[model samples]
Target: STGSATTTPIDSLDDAYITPVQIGTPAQTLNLDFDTGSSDLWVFSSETTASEVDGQTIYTPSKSTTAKLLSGATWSISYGDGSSSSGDVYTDTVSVGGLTVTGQAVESAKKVSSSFTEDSTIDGLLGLAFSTLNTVSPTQQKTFFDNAKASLDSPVFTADLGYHAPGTYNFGFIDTTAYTGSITYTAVSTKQGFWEWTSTGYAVGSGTFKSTSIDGIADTGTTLLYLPATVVSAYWAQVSGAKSSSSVGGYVFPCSATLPSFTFGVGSARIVIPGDYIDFGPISTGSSSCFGGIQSSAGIGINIFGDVALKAAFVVFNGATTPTLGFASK
Candidate 1:
């Protein structure tokens, strides 16, 4: 029987960002990021200069009994946010949770910059989102999932993003009990890393924006929800006494007694954005000013539903199946 279709999005966290994986008899850990925008698994090493490795987690290959170097080949990667890193190739036994895989290709960067180094919140990113933007070349290539696939008990993988709460991003096995029924899936386009889709329309409060049609990518790397200027303005106008505030780089609104929910339709599937996602931090901007999650990307053509919007549903990217994207319940 064919597997059920579903869409799962990744979540961001403080402590749970990096997971512990065994490298052999010894154990090591690395930070994981669901970057559909880029592909590659990178970790810091002790060979890097102290100044360059500052604030990042450095791995010691010597300590791992099963570590091996990948000849003299060097690798480098850059992100959409302008972050870049360069490192030599290395091979190590890798394991996550209790699942173990051998001969995994790992990148040990000597230098890294951009949002990754400045943020200091995350050390590294495990690019499991898709293979379209993979930096791993055929000559010297391997991904965390690619190596682990052979050892995985199930052929399927699923991400259950329980953001602001504890949840597990499952690999090899997908829990069918989490949803009401089979999930709806859309075929992934040949576009780079961006998963493009079409939205039938958008609705804010009781008013519907019938003429507002949108097409954009679903990105996990981006932190904010970017929408076209017209759609953004129309949605905000529905808020009672909504006003633009300067705190969060764009227009923010005032929190009132009751706020309306916004919904987006993709074919027969309808995704809703709750009011809390609209409201920013608890601290008031002023007497009545509160922040709204929506941001203005007037000139940008792509509307990204970042982690905030994705965490509300169960999403899956089936690279092994049909290069398609699927969504379901958590």
Candidate 2:
């Protein structure tokens, strides 16, 4: 059976998109960040310390008859932004948008960092990365997509993200109406536990496209598009009065600067991003400074084609024999 989920892009302060998920027999539902950057289905649970509980909801496994502990096993995960969580494990019936995955490994958080606790928005994270990245100890766990794929009509999932609008995550099939033109596919190199691929070249606006290979991961959890330092430097060079600011972080430019469209290529297909979308708004209240949506991926090890980039296109995370990525205009 196939399943699909509709998600509203929450207006959190630079946060990821959130979706509701259910666990255990009676169906305890919690909203989670559908992250493609990591693999794990974890939640704030009864074991969580009181100090860690902000306004977020908790998962009470004891209240569910179908919950079973994977005794002696533990799991821990930390994000780039310093948010972290660790907890024991539970195998329960998990569902998203009415699709069920029995005995799904549900890591119940006992300790949560300020990142998870203070946000008080999402209950936890629903990882869409390869199963190998799951952090469960003794034996790594599998993702919801991994456990659900075998029974799906096809071993595939699609990410249809939006710009401050409602979007969806689809399983087992693709909706042609969600995108335009043919879905141009590119080979993915899963050597790093992500949907890693390289673009043939990039162009700023309608200018000539450069044939520089830029490798990156399609990360739904991230908010901005991060390219290599040189690539980012080149983009900012085009904007007058743009500079890398210490107080503002990354590259900042005059709000009135006329920006150009950013385009990337996958084979013969070109995905163009609008200029208005690249300007990530002002620095703060009563400020004339603004930040560019594209940043440097230098220290981050790998380039990240984050929400700013993915939201401009319809992305298909095809999980066949070898994963292939398909991109099209929205």
Candidate 3:
């Protein structure tokens, strides 16, 4: 069930930061971190009484002339990164870029770890991933998208990762200028939060696995791509004069020769992973290390295509529609 809705303006002012959105009638300005792995919006606040809460930038509503607390809705979240926080829910007006959404659902976590509390660079996390994983339940809350869905020009949202070099992350509407044609879209499966797919085979340069077949899931929450060890060994064998060395607990390879391109089919769409991605930093042993896209997960139920693979295309997860995933170019 849907709850009361509001609209707020969101904007990115510069390459380094996106301006805060003003929340609620009183309007509290809050910085948001856009995340694709999970759905939720959490903020720091003064209501937190935990003494362990150190190094974090706490939002003292008492300090802000416009801040207001929801009084009853409290929350806490744990991430795969081994970080967590606890706090109450607050409803306020939130504005980002030039868009303004009101009565937006927000969390005020008082007891936060050093990663979030100490990092001056990161203010808060704004999950654009999927609404199903959202911490704000329909019973007590609704997310920013839940409120802004109706007014959005398109049911689409794009993520721009070109900023912060190659490793840094960014999310939002797909920039149409980046593409020469419309992107191919894939229908999503509702069984899990991941983008599930079946692979025909691995392709390296002009050669492809003629007989090997695999199935996997594309996940943003995971930072690295994981494939079966057998598949990785076979693919690495194709790299000209490539030798495997264990560093960073993974395989490393270097070849002066031109590397081949690897493409995998996601439904009817083919995603290409370039050679640059395969060439990783040199391990401590002085060998050029590569993130083995494939690893040993013998009993692991499914393989995963993490952000490394997603960076190649623009993806949109539609929780409001038919639970489908839309892909495009940014």
Candidate 4:
């Protein structure tokens, strides 16, 4: 079986993408962020207090006849941004687009941190990474993709992210018409529970492509691109007014500075992210300085090719016995 869904950017910066997912017998739909960096399909639920609800939708298992509590099971997760959520687990019928999965583990959130509460557009996160990263304890749970892999026409999924627009997430088969040029496939390491691969190298604008191998992960849940400090410095140094600021927490530049495009390699193929995409919005409303979308991964420990880079290409997360990742221009 196959499934397809449209993921929409929450705001102008394209901070996160949310896709509609159906849960339970009658099917209560909630918009979820399809996160590739981690595992655990969780949602805000009736268990959350009214004070923390804000305007986000909630999943009410008590209202679904098909929902069943997973005895003695619980889950808790923390993100790189220091935001976290935790709660109990339930097994229920879950559907995405037209694809259906019976008895999918649905982690119902009883508590969420401030960042998640403030971002009312996202109801929860649906993890697409390896199920080994699933936070459910004692009785480990499988990610939706993991459980559906056997039935999927192919053990693969594709992410076609867009700039300030709606993109698509497709499971089972590749959509050849969705991309341009031939796809470049590279080996992926699941040891870290991420779609991690090594980039051949990078070049600033039309500069020469360096031959250094850079290892990183493709994370749809994150908003920016994080690379080695040397690479980040190289890119920002080319901008006249750009400077790494401790007070600002990252590289910032004059709003009018001319930003150069960023290009990275996958095998022999090169994917270029336009300069405008790197000039993340202003530091604040009416501010003269703008934040850079490409930041140093020095503090993050792991380099992440987040939405900023993924939006520039069609990414295939192959979950075959020996996993691989494919990239193609779009």
Whichever of 3 and 4 has more lDDT, that candidate is 4
Pick the winner on TM-score between candidates 1 and 3.
Answer: 1
Instruction: Please give, for residues 244-289, the per-residue lDDT of candidate 4 as tens digits.
Output: 9999899999998889999999999999999988978789899999
Where model 2 places Cα greater than 4 Å from the true spot, the runs are: 12-14
Scored against the true structure, residue 134 in model 1 reaches a CA lDDT of 56
* CA lDDT of every candidate: 0.61, 0.87, 0.55, 0.95
How do the residues 1-330 of candidate 1 rate in per-residue lDDT, one tens digit apiece? 122222222232211233444443477765556455555767777776566655765678888888888786677787544578877767887666566667777677777774555544455666665555555544456566656665566544555555556445566665777655566676565465556666667778766546445776666666556777777787788777776555645775655635666776656676677666565543443546655667666655567766555655666655554565667644
- Candidate 4 regions with alpha-carbon error over 4 angstroms: none
Report the number of clashing residue pairs per model: 12, 0, 37, 0
Encode model 2's per-residue lDDT on 80-175: one tens digit a residue: 656789999999999988789999999999999887887778899999989889999998889999998899888888888877777998888888
Write down the TM-score of every candidate. Answer: 0.80, 0.96, 0.70, 0.99
Index of the highest-TM-score prediction: 4
Instruction: Please report, as a residue range, the 10-residue window in candidate 3 with the lowest summed lDDT.
Output: 5-14
Model 3 spans > 4 angstroms off = 1-31, 47-58, 63-66, 114-119, 136-140, 163-175, 193-202, 209-222, 228-230, 235-249, 252-260, 278-304
Ordered list by lDDT, greatest first = 4, 2, 1, 3
Winner on lDDT (1 vs 3) = 1
TM-score of 2: 0.96
Q: Write the per-residue lDDT of candidate 3 for residues 157-240, one digit (tens) a residue.
A: 554333224322212344456544567665656455444555556666567544455666555544455677776666677776
